[PDB]
């Protein structure tokens, strides 16, 4: 059945990490390239998507007086960007320059939009290919578990001890060879139930 | 810690 | 206001070209903008001479920037035809550099021109 | 403690002992001369 | 014999009134030099009577250039007119001696002082900064200096946008990044549709 | 020596904000406020710390006289993290960038320059470093930039001018804190080539005493420079 | 005697390098660091009392 | 990190005993203790230093010592010097 | 012909939605890359007309980036400029002579661009 293939999950989780890396590099480029026009923004607004949206609404600092950033930013932050716009140390840019920077920012929000779509799609795949696992550990940790082993079957043939320390091999074998205590959480540390526990109960 | 350890089962 | 600044008067130009000829005979002269640039990087330049009639003047405007960063005196002379002739070579020279040497035979003469160039700047 | 080591780690361990003996020899020789003076 | 003091800030012009006059013959004595440092003792000497902030970045740069050249702007001529009594002659403490002649021409009834007694008072105002404004809105003096310093420097240098080659550098490093991503994403599209 | 892909050990110096990179050779190092690029072509050292990739820059004692001071063993430096510094004679970002690194995000550097051509590179460098305020103005007339500078912790003077003592005096009286630091780089040839360097160094120390500046230590900058010294003093405005 | 004093003087120039730091032209080539190392806890400045 | 990795410990020994690495190189006397806090860094050359001060990629190694083993001149000297000391011992 | 008869396994509608949507993202980036390339050529002409004319907009822009700025490039000596592009072969026994010769002219062109308020392309053409 098309709805019970695990090769989609292993690729989706790999794709999702690839998107996060590429979306981050473009965000830095926009913060650097647009930072020439107005370098104080990066310190005020840290979110890459929110940073990109400000450029789309107002391409130039002069526009900051009239442009409204309410839908992007809270009240106290949106006024900080307005004050900084006038007293900025940056240089003016041509409309030819502005056209390509807006194009880059559009790619930020479009990539951010698709990243949210892929996150939902991975949840849908996980709730159909391994519904029982998702009910217990969750979609994100569940998908990470499956991808680490390489297949759903390869994970099924593993004892629960390995599933406990599945993502901590660097620490595990270092400890085993050096007569030291071994890790006790691995990749399951980010499961919701583990977080609810406290102290030594996390290990249990 | 090379002085502390000793090598065995040399191959 | 003009890019080539300060420009030495007629009297100072002859005094500068006198020192250039002596340094040429004593192997204390670097001819050409490329060789002049290296001396500034090594900090072995006593001062720089440039030609104000260079065509275009912009191909030697990196030198004043390097000098002012390094606190090295520099001056412009009106003619590259005259500068190259006094340098001892058969071609025009747009820039020349007097190499630092406190054991030179022309040390007093070099410092005399250097003092006047600082006054010019 | 007894351990089992790979070839590269043995070479790394062999090298560091060679260095330490040379340093000890160079230091002691340096000491003896200054003591003599 | 100082009664009013003029201080220039990045944010505006502040006029102070000298309540008590410090000893002049004993100016170099340590105890009078310590009073300048101590805020509690300094506040007994002067008190703020007027502060006129600038309209924005443009006015601050204009007045920075005028103060740099020892000239009286319309903004400065306004605050001095509002504060200085017309009166024999009112005495105004200013940091710059070059500004003294300019103020005298506009106001024949004010005598400007920039001696060391004036400098010590200007020094104390600079030392304590916003603390002397008693809660009045003067922005942040340190953050305003950064913008004005850049604006001041770039005006003298006549820095212009046309010179910038940073647009070139950002373009190059972005183009090859796009080329890598166009390939990387496109190959995946071959895999995803490759199954189908 | 210190080639491209070589590995080094980074440890702190006795001075705060200054580091040493060990190896077959040793390097003086400051943490990069603007990572990813060099200011004047110096070597950089990357460390992976929890993982973010922090960067460091090499400080060349032959290019910076302050670095030549660190190498020669200066006892007290008032340039330290969280201090405002007035840098007189900031030709470009060669040495101000390293001073900006030491003071860090919380401190600031007031970089004063006169010539316009070096000033352009100073302004360009200052955009990458928000803690640098470039002031393209003559240090002989501090009144022209009194609006731009507040009270400062340390005054560093690298002006290579015969009347540098007056300039250091004028700027300290307005902007320097009581008990503030003063660090002068003196080049004997610039002040008086007619007499020996030792006579010049003694004369400049006398002028500082005349200006209520108490010298603390003096250091000559061989092998990196010839006929150069750094004098470190304290501004005692109350009394000497 | 001329040769004897020549060898005496060149010998003294070597020993002067072991008594104090001497300027020897500055930097030659790419900067390769401090070859003999940096001492963190030693100061050579002359202190005013 | 407590229980520090062996490669870090063995590199800290190289800096401490750097006086013996090269017969021609000598150092100021220094009692170098392992600092409380430190980092391991990799140098980045300038692009203008491609010929003068750049290592080839294959020569680069994760540790300082592994590069030192690669140097053939160093290995030859250590082998000769080591034998002489053992003969005397 | 292949579509009528093939061994490909049909994937879900949600999967097909991502193949197209992901393909739209790839398609848009190619369009923007072409736009940014044209922006580069126009910007190279105004900023560095002499250098862009002599070698090209893309090659000249890479040379500027390796120097770190146009100001850095104009300050370097001719020998350093040649080894500034000796790692991507920007200027590339008779072959070496031209590469050195072109490097010297590139050094001159960068100076006319950097130290002119409104650089022209007249000298780059003759160069």
């Amino acid at each position: 059945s098309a709805d019970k293939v695990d090769v989609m999950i292993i690729q989706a989780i790999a794709l999702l990490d690839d998107l996060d890396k590429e979306l981050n590099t473009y965000a830095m480029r926009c913060k650097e390239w647009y930072g020439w026009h107005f370098p104080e923004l990066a310190k005020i607004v840290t979110d890459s998507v929110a940073y990109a949206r400000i450029i789309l609404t107002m391409g130039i600092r002069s526009k900051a007086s009239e442009t409204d950033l309410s839908e992007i930013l809270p009240e106290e932050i949106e006024e900080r960007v307005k004050t900084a716009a006038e007293v900025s140390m940056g240089t003016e840019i041509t409309q030819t320059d502005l056209d390509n920077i807006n194009a880059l920012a559009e790619q930020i929000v479009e990539f951010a939009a698709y990243r949210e779509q892929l996150s939902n799609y991975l949840s849908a795949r996980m709730k159909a290919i391994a519904p029982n696992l998702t009910q217990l550990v969750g979609e994100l940790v569940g998908a990470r578990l499956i991808a680490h082993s390489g297949s759903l079957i390869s994970l099924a043939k593993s004892p629960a001890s390995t599933i406990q320390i599945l993502g901590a091999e660097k620490a595990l074998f270092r400890a085993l060879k050096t007569k030291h205590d071994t890790p006790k959480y691995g990749l399951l540390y980010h499961a919701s139930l583990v977080g609810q526990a406290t102290g030594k109960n996390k290990g249990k | 810690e090379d002085e502390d350890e000793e090598e065995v089962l040399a191959m | 206001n003009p890019k080539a600044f300060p420009l030495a008067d007629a009297a100072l130009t002859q005094q500068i070209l006198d020192v250039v000829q002596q340094a040429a005979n004593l192997r204390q002269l670097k001819k050409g903008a490329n060789e002049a640039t290296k001396t500034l990087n090594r900090g072995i330049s006593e001062f720089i001479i440039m030609a104000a009639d260079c065509e275009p003047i912009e191909i030697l405007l990196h030198l004043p920037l390097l000098c002012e960063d390094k606190n090295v005196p520099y001056v412009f002379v009106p003619s590259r035809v005259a500068l190259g002739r006094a340098c001892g070579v058969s071609r025009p020279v747009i820039a020349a550099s007097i190499t630092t040497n406190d054991a030179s035979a022309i040390k007093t003469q070099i410092y005399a021109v250097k003092d006047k160039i600082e006054t010019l700047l | 403690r007894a351990v089992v080591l790979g070839g590269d780690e043995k070479k790394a361990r062999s090298f560091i002992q060679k260095v330490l003996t040379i340093s000890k020899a160079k230091d002691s020789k340096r000491k003896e001369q200054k003591a003599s003076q | 014999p100082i009664e009013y003091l003029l201080f220039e800030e990045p944010t505006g012009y502040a006029v102070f009134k000298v309540k008590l006059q410090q000893d002049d013959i004993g100016s170099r004595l340590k105890e009078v030099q310590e009073q300048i440092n101590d805020f509690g003792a300094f506040t007994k000497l002067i008190e703020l009577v007027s502060f006129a902030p600038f309209k924005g970045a443009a006015e601050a740069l204009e007045n920075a250039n005028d103060i740099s050249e020892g000239l009286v702007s319309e903004s400065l001529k306004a605050i001095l007119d509002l504060n200085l009594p017309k009166a024999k002659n009112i005495t105004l403490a200013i940091s710059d001696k070059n500004l003294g002649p300019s103020i005298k021409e506009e106001f024949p009834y004010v005598d400007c002082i920039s001696n060391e007694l004036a400098q010590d008072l200007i020094r104390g105002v600079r030392l304590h900064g916003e603390k002397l404004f008693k809660g009045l809105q003067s922005g942040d003096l340190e953050r305003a200096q950064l913008g004005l310093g850049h604006a001041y420097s770039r005006a003298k240098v006549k820095f212009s946008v046309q010179k910038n080659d940073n647009h070139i550098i950002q373009a190059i490093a972005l183009l090859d990044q796009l080329d890598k991503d166009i390939n990387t994403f496109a190959m995946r599209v071959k895999e995803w549709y490759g199954w189908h | 020596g210190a080639r491209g892909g070589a590995k080094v050990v980074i440890e702190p110096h006795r001075h705060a904000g200054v580091y040493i990179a060990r190896g077959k050779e040793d390097l003086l190092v400051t943490k990069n406020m603007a990572p990813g690029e060099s200011v004047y072509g110096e070597k950089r050292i990357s460390v992976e710390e929890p993982p973010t990739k922090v960067e460091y820059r090499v400080w060349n004692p032959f290019r910076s006289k302050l670095a030549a001071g660190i190498m020669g063993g200066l006892d007290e430096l008032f340039i330290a993290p969280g201090k405002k510094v007035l840098y007189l004679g900031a030709a470009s970002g060669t040495s101000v960038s390293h001073v900006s690194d030491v003071v860090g995000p919380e401190g600031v550097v007031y970089a004063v320059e006169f010539s316009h051509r070096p000033g352009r590179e100073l302004i360009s460098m200052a955009k990458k470093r928000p803690n640098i305020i470039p002031i393209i103005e003559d240090a002989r007339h501090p009144q022209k930039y009194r609006m731009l500078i507040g009270m400062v912790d340390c005054v560093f003077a690298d002006v290579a001018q015969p009347d540098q003592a007056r300039i250091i005096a004028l700027n300290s009286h307005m902007f320097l804190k009581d008990q503030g630091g003063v660090v002068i780089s003196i080049k004997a040839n610039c002040i008086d080539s007619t007499v020996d360097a030792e006579t010049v160094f003694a004369r400049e120390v006398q002028k500082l005493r005349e200006e209520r500046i108490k010298p603390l230590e003096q250091l000559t900058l061989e092998p990196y420079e010839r006929d150069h010294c750094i004098v470190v003093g304290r501004y005692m405005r109350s009394g000497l | 005697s001329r040769v004897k004093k020549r060898k005496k003087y060149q010998k003294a120039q070597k020993k002067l390098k072991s008594v104090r730091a001497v300027y020897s032209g500055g930097q030659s080539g790419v900067y390769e660091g401090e070859k003999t190392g940096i001492k963190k806890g030693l100061t050579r400045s002359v202190k005013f009392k | 990190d407590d229980n520090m990795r062996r490669e870090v410990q063995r590199d800290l020994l190289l800096i401490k005993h750097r006086a013996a690495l090269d017969p021609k190189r000598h150092y100021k006397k220094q009692r170098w203790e392992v600092p409380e806090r430190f980092a391991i860094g990799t140098i980045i050359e300038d692009k203008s230093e491609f010929y003068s001060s750049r290592m080839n990629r294959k020569e680069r190694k994760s540790t300082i010592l592994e590069t030192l083993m690669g140097d053939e001149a160093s290995n030859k000297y250590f082998k000769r010097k080591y034998n002489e000391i053992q003969e005397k011992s | 012909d292949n579509a009528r008869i093939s061994m490909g396994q049909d994937i879900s509608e949600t999967d097909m939605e991502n193949v197209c949507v992901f393909a739209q993202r790839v398609a848009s980036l190619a369009d923007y890359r072409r736009q940014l390339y044209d922006y580069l050529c126009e910007k190279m002409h105004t900023v560095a007309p002499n250098l862009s004319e002599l070698i090209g907009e893309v090659i000249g822009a890479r040379l500027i980036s390796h120097a770190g700025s146009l100001t850095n490039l104009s300050k370097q000596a001719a020998s350093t400029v040649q080894i500034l592009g000796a790692e991507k072969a920007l200027f590339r026994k008779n072959k070496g002579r031209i590469s050195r010769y072109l490097a010297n002219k590139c050094s001159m062109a960068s100076r006319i661009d950097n130290y002119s308020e409104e650089p022209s392309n007249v000298f780059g053409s003759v160069l």
Side-chain angles (χ1 to χ4, degrees):
Chain A
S1 63
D3 60 355
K4 292 187 182 189
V5 293
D6 209 292
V7 293
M8 295 298 102
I9 291 164
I10 199 171
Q11 291 179 354
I13 199 77
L15 176 59
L16 201 61
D17 291 286
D18 193 308
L19 262 62
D20 289 330
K21 183 174 73 175
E22 301 302 330
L23 162 79
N24 196 18
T25 59
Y26 295 161
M28 285 194 238
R29 179 65 65 192
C30 182
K31 287 186 184 181
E32 290 179 351
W33 194 2
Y34 187 71
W36 199 250
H37 186 64
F38 175 58
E40 296 87 1
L41 196 51
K43 300 289 94 175
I44 302 295
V45 64
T46 68
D47 190 5
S48 300
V49 178
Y51 185 100
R53 280 155 65 64
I54 296 162
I55 298 172
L56 300 171
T57 55
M58 49 165 264
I60 292 190
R61 286 162 297 170
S62 169
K63 300 289 182 65
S65 179
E66 200 282 322
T67 306
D68 184 73
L69 308 192
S70 55
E71 70 279 25
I72 303 163
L73 311 166
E75 192 184 10
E76 65 280 5
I77 297 89
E78 67 181 2
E79 56 84 16
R80 293 180 181 177
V81 295
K82 287 184 177 182
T83 62
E86 187 179 3
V87 311
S88 58
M89 56 165 90
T91 303
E92 322 316 305
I93 55 160
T94 63
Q95 186 67 21
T96 300
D97 286 280
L98 191 63
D99 283 23
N100 307 102
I101 301 175
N102 290 127
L104 177 60
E106 287 167 342
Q107 297 298 337
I108 301 298
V109 303
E110 290 170 358
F111 270 40
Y114 176 62
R115 205 274 188 182
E116 184 64 7
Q117 295 295 109
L118 199 61
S119 180
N120 293 336
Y121 162 70
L122 184 53
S123 180
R125 295 280 77 205
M126 281 303 312
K127 289 180 291 192
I129 305 172
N132 293 278
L133 185 58
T134 63
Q135 294 289 350
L136 188 68
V137 304
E139 309 91 348
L140 183 63
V141 296
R144 284 270 159 70
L145 285 165
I146 295 165
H148 179 283
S149 59
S151 179
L152 197 66
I153 299 169
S154 172
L155 200 71
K157 297 186 295 188
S158 310
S161 311
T162 61
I163 300 175
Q164 189 184 354
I165 56 172
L166 206 57
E169 279 95 341
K170 180 174 293 181
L172 171 67
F173 300 110
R174 179 173 75 246
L176 290 164
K177 299 169 193 174
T178 197
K179 185 131 66 173
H180 192 229
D181 292 347
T182 59
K184 56 200 162 188
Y185 311 116
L187 189 149
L188 280 175
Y189 190 67
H190 308 94
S192 61
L193 287 85
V194 185
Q196 293 184 36
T198 61
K200 289 180 62 176
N201 301 0
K202 290 202 171 192
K204 294 182 169 183
Chain B
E1 296 182 4
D2 291 331
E3 65 296 338
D4 185 75
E5 291 187 354
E6 184 179 1
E7 192 276 332
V8 302
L9 301 179
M11 184 177 176
Chain C
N1 189 358
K3 292 181 181 180
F5 189 96
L7 181 71
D9 63 50
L12 179 52
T13 295
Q14 300 335 302
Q15 193 174 321
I16 290 161
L17 289 193
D18 288 5
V19 180
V20 164
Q21 197 204 37
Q22 309 285 84
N25 301 342
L26 288 173
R27 312 142 300 264
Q28 198 167 353
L29 185 68
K30 300 295 185 178
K31 301 161 279 293
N34 279 315
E35 282 184 350
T37 305
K38 299 170 197 173
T39 59
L40 292 175
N41 294 349
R42 291 146 200 207
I44 64 176
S45 176
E46 182 65 26
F47 57 85
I48 303 295
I49 298 89
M50 281 159 285
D53 60 307
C54 187
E55 280 182 2
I57 193 62
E58 279 88 19
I59 64 176
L60 61 83
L61 290 179
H62 67 294
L63 294 168
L65 175 64
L66 294 166
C67 287
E68 292 182 356
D69 181 273
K70 298 268 173 152
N71 296 115
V72 179
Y74 68 91
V75 71
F76 286 90
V77 295
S79 176
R80 68 184 181 273
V81 176
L83 178 56
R85 183 149 188 237
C87 278
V89 300
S90 305
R91 292 290 297 172
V93 174
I94 71 174
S97 176
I98 308 297
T99 286
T100 300
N101 185 1
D102 298 278
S104 66
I106 54 168
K107 182 174 72 68
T108 299
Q109 187 175 2
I110 288 169
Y111 296 165
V113 176
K114 185 177 180 180
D115 265 331
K116 291 174 71 175
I117 291 169
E118 298 190 19
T119 300
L120 204 73
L121 295 164
Chain D
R1 67 185 68 188
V3 297
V4 171
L5 295 174
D8 304 286
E9 177 66 351
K10 292 181 181 179
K11 294 181 176 67
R13 289 189 195 214
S14 179
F15 181 88
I16 192 56
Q17 279 74 244
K18 283 200 187 111
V19 164
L20 288 167
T21 64
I22 294 172
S23 288
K24 205 173 109 154
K26 178 174 254 280
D27 275 28
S28 66
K29 185 179 170 187
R30 182 67 177 172
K31 181 266 289 180
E32 185 178 3
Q33 182 177 357
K34 284 214 178 173
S36 86
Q37 300 171 12
Chain E
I2 301 169
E3 293 179 353
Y4 289 91
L5 183 141
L6 175 62
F7 198 81
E8 303 81 8
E9 288 182 351
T11 55
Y13 293 111
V15 172
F16 298 75
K17 182 168 185 178
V18 185
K19 296 181 290 182
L20 183 63
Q21 292 175 0
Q22 70 276 17
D23 204 340
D24 60 354
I25 298 175
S27 292
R28 298 290 185 87
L29 269 45
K30 71 181 294 185
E31 66 275 8
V32 300
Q33 295 290 1
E34 292 291 358
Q35 295 305 59
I36 297 293
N37 295 318
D38 186 6
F39 181 65
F42 190 66
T43 52
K44 290 186 283 184
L45 300 191
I46 61 168
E47 61 86 20
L48 181 80
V49 294
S50 177
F51 176 63
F54 303 137
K55 312 152 169 39
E59 188 187 7
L61 179 61
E62 296 160 1
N63 299 14
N65 297 355
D66 295 1
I67 290 295
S68 176
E69 278 158 272
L71 304 183
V72 174
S73 304
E74 281 304 297
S75 178
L76 178 58
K77 188 157 56 179
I79 187 166
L80 292 190
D81 189 358
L82 178 74
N83 291 308
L84 295 179
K86 184 173 289 223
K88 168 196 175 179
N89 269 17
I90 192 68
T91 287
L92 180 63
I94 60 178
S95 181
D96 190 3
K97 67 177 72 65
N98 303 334
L99 190 67
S102 305
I103 294 167
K104 190 61 174 182
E105 294 293 328
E106 302 290 357
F107 306 109
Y109 48 93
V110 63
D111 291 356
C112 296
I113 294 189
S114 52
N115 62 3
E116 182 175 86
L117 274 295
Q119 297 304 122
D120 295 16
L121 292 183
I122 303 296
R123 183 178 175 85
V125 175
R126 199 181 306 286
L127 183 49
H128 304 118
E130 65 274 16
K131 192 184 288 185
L132 292 158
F133 285 82
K134 310 162 296 179
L136 287 176
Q137 298 191 359
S138 66
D140 173 32
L141 312 180
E142 182 65 26
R143 186 179 296 276
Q145 284 172 335
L146 176 79
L148 191 60
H150 276 269
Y152 181 83
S153 295
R154 286 173 46 178
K156 306 179 74 62
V157 170
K158 308 185 180 306
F159 171 92
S160 170
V161 57
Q162 160 54 37
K163 289 280 206 171
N164 296 115
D165 63 324
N166 290 318
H167 296 285
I168 299 299
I169 304 181
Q170 300 297 292
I172 297 294
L174 189 48
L175 273 175
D176 60 2
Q177 185 63 254
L178 285 179
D179 297 330
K180 184 174 73 68
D181 269 5
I182 289 178
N183 189 358
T184 302
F185 299 151
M187 294 299 291
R188 293 182 184 271
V189 175
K190 289 179 177 294
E191 310 309 331
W192 292 97
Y193 192 82
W195 301 99
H196 167 86
Chain F
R3 282 156 69 198
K7 300 295 289 184
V8 295
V9 174
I10 305 298
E11 66 182 1
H13 200 272
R14 173 172 53 87
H15 301 290
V18 188
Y19 301 95
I20 309 172
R22 303 277 178 190
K24 186 180 289 293
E25 307 89 17
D26 287 355
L27 293 154
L28 198 61
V29 169
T30 64
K31 185 174 178 179
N32 199 353
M33 278 288 297
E37 182 65 26
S38 73
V39 176
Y40 63 100
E42 67 279 10
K43 293 174 182 177
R44 313 181 312 266
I45 308 167
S46 61
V47 299
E48 293 179 353
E49 66 89 17
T52 301
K53 186 179 287 293
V54 166
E55 209 170 48
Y56 289 89
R57 311 172 42 231
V58 172
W59 206 348
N60 181 1
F62 294 93
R63 290 291 277 290
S64 177
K65 297 183 185 318
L66 181 60
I70 314 304
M71 293 317 194
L74 274 179
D75 190 2
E76 184 158 5
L77 267 68
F78 306 97
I79 305 179
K83 294 181 176 67
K84 296 182 176 67
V85 169
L86 173 50
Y87 199 114
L88 300 176
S92 300
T94 300
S95 179
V96 177
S97 59
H98 280 297
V99 169
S100 176
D101 287 347
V102 174
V103 299
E106 69 275 16
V108 309
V109 182
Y110 297 100
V112 180
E113 181 55 35
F114 182 76
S115 45
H116 290 80
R117 291 188 296 272
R120 277 185 190 81
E121 289 65 52
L122 186 70
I123 297 168
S124 297
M125 183 278 288
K127 302 166 198 177
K128 277 74 69 177
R129 305 293 186 82
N131 75 70
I132 309 183
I133 297 165
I135 306 174
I136 305 302
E137 193 61 48
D138 202 352
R140 276 191 262 282
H141 305 112
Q143 295 302 117
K144 288 186 172 67
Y145 48 89
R146 57 186 193 273
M147 291 177 72
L148 294 172
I149 296 171
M151 185 64 72
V152 65
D153 289 81
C154 169
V155 169
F156 183 99
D158 199 338
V159 300
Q161 293 179 356
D163 71 313
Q164 62 171 26
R166 184 176 176 87
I167 290 152
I168 295 144
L170 294 177
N171 289 261
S172 312
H173 293 333
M174 308 180 48
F175 308 123
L176 187 54
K177 292 179 184 180
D178 189 358
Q179 312 303 313
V182 181
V183 181
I184 308 106
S185 174
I186 308 174
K187 177 174 178 180
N189 259 338
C190 286
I191 307 185
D192 193 5
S193 66
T194 300
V195 301
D196 194 55
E198 275 292 346
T199 300
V200 174
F201 300 156
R203 277 201 216 131
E204 303 315 309
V205 169
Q206 178 55 209
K207 286 168 199 193
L208 293 162
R209 296 179 191 271
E210 271 168 45
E211 298 144 2
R212 282 183 287 164
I213 294 167
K214 182 176 183 180
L216 304 173
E217 56 179 359
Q218 184 172 231
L219 179 86
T220 300
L221 298 194
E222 303 88 28
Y224 314 110
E225 313 277 334
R226 185 179 67 189
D227 291 322
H228 275 81
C229 74
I230 286 171
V231 176
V232 165
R234 184 184 302 287
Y235 181 41
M236 311 204 57
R237 184 176 175 87
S238 83
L240 298 169
Chain G
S1 310
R2 185 192 36 91
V3 171
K4 174 162 201 282
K5 287 181 179 58
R6 180 186 189 174
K7 283 161 149 52
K8 197 181 308 311
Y9 179 59
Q10 80 189 37
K11 188 178 187 185
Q13 280 181 320
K14 308 281 184 53
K15 293 195 174 181
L16 189 63
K17 296 171 74 173
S18 81
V19 171
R20 58 173 182 86
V22 305
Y23 183 76
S24 74
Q27 183 190 355
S28 47
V30 69
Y31 175 62
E32 291 185 352
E34 302 321 278
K35 290 173 70 174
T36 64
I38 294 166
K39 296 170 79 71
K40 180 171 74 67
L42 176 58
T43 54
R44 311 305 305 268
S45 63
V46 182
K47 296 182 179 174
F48 298 79
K49 301 94 169 175
Chain H
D1 177 273
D2 289 331
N3 188 358
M4 71 154 69
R5 185 177 65 246
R6 297 292 299 274
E7 285 80 3
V8 188
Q9 199 170 18
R10 194 178 298 114
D11 291 331
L12 294 167
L13 279 180
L14 274 184
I15 297 89
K16 178 174 174 65
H17 294 91
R18 60 182 173 192
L21 300 182
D22 185 325
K24 295 186 181 295
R25 295 282 306 277
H26 301 101
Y27 294 86
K28 305 152 95 78
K29 292 188 285 292
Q30 178 148 20
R31 278 72 173 178
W32 182 83
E33 307 319 321
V34 184
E36 184 65 26
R37 290 178 186 268
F38 66 85
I40 310 288
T42 305
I43 291 166
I44 295 94
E45 79 289 9
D46 201 70
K47 292 182 182 179
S48 57
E49 284 155 271
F50 173 77
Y51 295 114
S52 54
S53 179
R54 198 195 86 97
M55 310 184 59
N56 290 318
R57 174 176 70 69
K58 290 180 176 69
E59 306 200 319
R60 299 166 190 218
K61 311 282 181 266
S62 73
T63 72
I64 309 164
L65 197 152
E66 192 174 4
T67 74
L68 182 50
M69 284 197 258
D71 177 22
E72 182 65 26
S74 296
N75 301 336
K76 205 175 283 215
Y77 163 76
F78 290 131
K79 182 174 72 68
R80 154 169 78 85
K81 181 64 70 176
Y82 188 71
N83 289 343
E84 297 180 291
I85 296 165
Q86 295 297 109
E87 297 267 328
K88 187 184 286 184
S89 66
Chain I
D1 186 74
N2 296 115
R4 291 158 52 183
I5 55 165
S6 63
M7 65 182 179
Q9 63 184 14
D10 189 0
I11 65 188
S12 78
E13 51 172 275
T14 61
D15 291 332
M16 203 49 36
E17 179 186 3
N18 309 327
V19 175
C20 65
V21 165
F22 194 36
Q24 295 297 109
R25 301 269 73 78
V26 177
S28 59
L29 269 73
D31 191 2
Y32 170 50
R33 193 271 191 190
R34 188 270 299 164
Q35 177 192 2
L36 185 69
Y37 168 65
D38 187 13
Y39 163 75
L40 183 48
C41 295
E42 165 55 23
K43 180 69 71 173
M44 269 296 306
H45 297 133
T46 191
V47 174
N50 302 138
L51 186 67
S52 60
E53 197 274 355
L54 180 71
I55 44 171
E57 292 76 60
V58 178
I59 303 299
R62 298 176 101 71
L63 198 70
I64 289 171
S65 72
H66 292 178
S69 63
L70 188 57
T71 305
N72 282 335
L73 182 63
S74 67
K75 294 163 58 178
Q76 303 306 286
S79 63
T80 317
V81 173
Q82 173 166 204
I83 66 190
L84 195 76
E87 190 276 331
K88 300 294 187 291
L90 306 182
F91 310 104
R92 297 81 187 167
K93 295 181 177 67
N94 209 352
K95 277 73 69 177
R97 297 208 181 70
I98 304 299
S99 178
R100 175 176 176 289
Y101 190 83
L102 181 56
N104 304 352
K105 299 287 176 286
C106 281
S107 193
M108 293 177 71
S110 70
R111 293 182 181 88
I112 306 165
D113 298 332
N114 186 227
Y115 305 108
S116 296
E117 277 81 346
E118 183 80 34
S120 51
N121 54 273
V122 62
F123 278 110
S125 62
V126 298
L127 210 61

